Amino acid sequence: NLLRLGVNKIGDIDSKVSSKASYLLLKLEQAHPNMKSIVIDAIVDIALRPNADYHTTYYSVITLNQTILKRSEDSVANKLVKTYFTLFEKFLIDEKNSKLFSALLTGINRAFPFAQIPASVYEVHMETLFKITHSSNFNTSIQALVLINQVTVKAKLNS
Amino acid sequence: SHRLYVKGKHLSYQRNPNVSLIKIEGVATPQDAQFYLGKRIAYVIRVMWGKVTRTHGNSGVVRATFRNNLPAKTFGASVRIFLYPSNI
Amino acid sequence: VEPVVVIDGKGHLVGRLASVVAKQLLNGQKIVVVRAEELNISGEFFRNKLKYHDFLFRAPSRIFYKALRGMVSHKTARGKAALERLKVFEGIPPPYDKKKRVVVPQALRVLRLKPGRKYTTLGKLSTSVGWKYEDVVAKLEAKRKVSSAEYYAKKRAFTKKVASANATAAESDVAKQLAALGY
Amino acid sequence: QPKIGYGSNKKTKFLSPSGHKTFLVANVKDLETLTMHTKTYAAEIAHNISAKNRVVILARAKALGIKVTNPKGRLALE
RNA sequence: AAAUUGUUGAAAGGGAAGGGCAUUUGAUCAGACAUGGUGU
RNA sequence: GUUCCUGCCGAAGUAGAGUUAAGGUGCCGGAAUACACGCUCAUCAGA
RNA sequence: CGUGGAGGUCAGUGACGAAGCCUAGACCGUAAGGUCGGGUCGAACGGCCUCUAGUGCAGAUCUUGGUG
Ligand SMILES: [Mg+2]
Ligand SMILES: [Mg+2]
Ligand SMILES: [Mg+2]
Ligand SMILES: [Mg+2]
Ligand SMILES: [Mg+2]
Ligand SMILES: [Mg+2]
Secondary structure, eight states: OHHHHHHHGGGOSSHHHHHHHHHHHHHHHHHOGGGHHHHHHHHHHHHTSTTOOHHHHHHHHHHHHTOOOOTTOHHHHHHHHHHHHHHHHHHHOOHHHHHHHHHHHHHHHHHSTTOOOOHHHHHHHHHHHHHHHTSSOHHHHHHHHHHHHHHHHHHTOOO | OOOOEEEEEEEEEOOOTTEEEEEOTTOOSHHHHGGGTTOEEEEOOOOEEEEEEEEETTTTEEEEEESSOOOSSOTTOEEEEEOOSOOO | OOSEEEEEOTTBBHHHHHHHHHHHHHTTOEEEEEOGGGOEEESOHHHHHHHHHHHOOOSHHHHHHHHHHHHTTTTSHHHHHHHHHOEEOSSOOTTGGGSOOBOOGGGBHHHHSOTTOOEEEHHHHHHHHTOTTHHHHHHHHHHHHHHHHHHHHHHHHHHHHHHHHHHHHHTOHHHHHHHHHOO | OOOGGGOOOTTTTTOOTTSOEEEEEOSHHHHHTTSSTTTTEEEEEOTTOOHHHHHHHHHHHHHHTOOBSSOSSSSSOO
């Protein structure tokens, strides 16, 4: 219940409260790595809500991006990559969008190592990633190119 | 040694930044302080000069007037009181 | 009269000792307090307990520091400077264990508090409020008292030597001629 | 709190630290009213004077030997 | 047009930005007697 | 409701020096933690 | 002291920068304020004698928009 309240305050109206909640959640993960999966699940529980609101999901994606991953946490990384892709399809389906895509690409790049997902999953979004590379915000195109390079290398596409 | 003075402490202001209260060692009574009236005071590098004006209370504390008032951060700072102008 | 004054805490009242020390610090004198655990307060144990509580640092030294800071205008530059001049300790840490320690008569409990009036020891208060170090300090104090007994024996021998030397100086002429002539 | 007891001495009133009473000046003709009172008064060029006129006023003031309170203003800054 | 919101860029900082106080070390600026006369 | 600033008259001032009333002299805070008496420490002590 | 109105006046001020506004700058006045410097401003306006209008705040019912 305490975690529910704390992660609920990610979607607060005031950006200061959301930032404080994100910082405290990241501190909580560091203090107790074992609850990292529970914290990530709780954050996912809000970001995917039908009434999530752009502020809440944006700060939640930031918090998920700033999580730390180890080479034995494939389940957590496999959770995070799928969550990022689901959110990406949710919002793709502009300036506010560009920042959220930047953060989502950052998260997918962070979690693409440590993630044992079939390459075919990324192949579905590959064209979409290229659509980002010519986007208005170059900060998104950098991360899109990073993701494209990583997927191409691991999947051994023609490149 | 070449000391021809007594190093005394600056206590506080009169309460008036113009007047300062000086505590001089080995002076328990106003009668003892009466000797030191008119002597030159020197707070020490830069030096500010002044003089002892009159006694203050029964503890032997004396009043003092400097050409420029002390900066108020010297309460408890060491201050010199020379023997000249001598009256003996 | 000394660059540094070491004041024993035993048998003193917190208010009077703190006031005297604060007055000295404001005059530039450097003072260090030791053996503050055995400091005394007037009243009964409960009343001081609830006073420190309605304040609620658990150590006796910190309680003394608060009491003294109440005198000094700490928020001013001068008050801060007076505060760095101060030092407080429970028991005697080095190197002050090798230095004799004065007593302030104005704050002495024996001279101030009337016989048959309840008082309170700061150590018991600090332990009751959550200071879990009164035990280690006591053993150090016992060792210090053994060392002090040895030092007292050495001082008695030194006083005997001083008496012998004073006798030796007596049978010299120049001092006797000087005293008769003047001084 | 302001009150009459704070009033300054008449002999020292309306005096700059240079010791010269400030007098506003617009043109050369008004400058020439201060020809001899150089000790008592110092000229001050008005704010609305153009740069071309200020140099003429300064030259005439130097010729007369009258102290200008604000020279090098709008010919230099500060 | 204000007020308001968002992307991008610079800087500081820390979980808040934040101030006041003290010390420390530095950098940089202003600082006449144009002293009236005589003498070799 | 209040009524730009200063001054003035009137029912029922600024600065230096000294003195002083009311007060006060444990510290913040300038002054004796001076003296001399009678008391009182009460689970309502007493400022 | 400050704000406008009118008459008179300063052979007033002005692209070599008028009016307006700001100015934790300098000078003056006990103060209301005034003068200058700088910034801003970019085309006209101010000082002075007279008569005539005319000095900054508080709070409530709430209202509206906007945001939760
Ligand atoms: Mg101007
Ligand atoms: Mg940076
Ligand atoms: Mg008077
Ligand atoms: Mg007119
Ligand atoms: Mg103005
Ligand atoms: Mg003035």
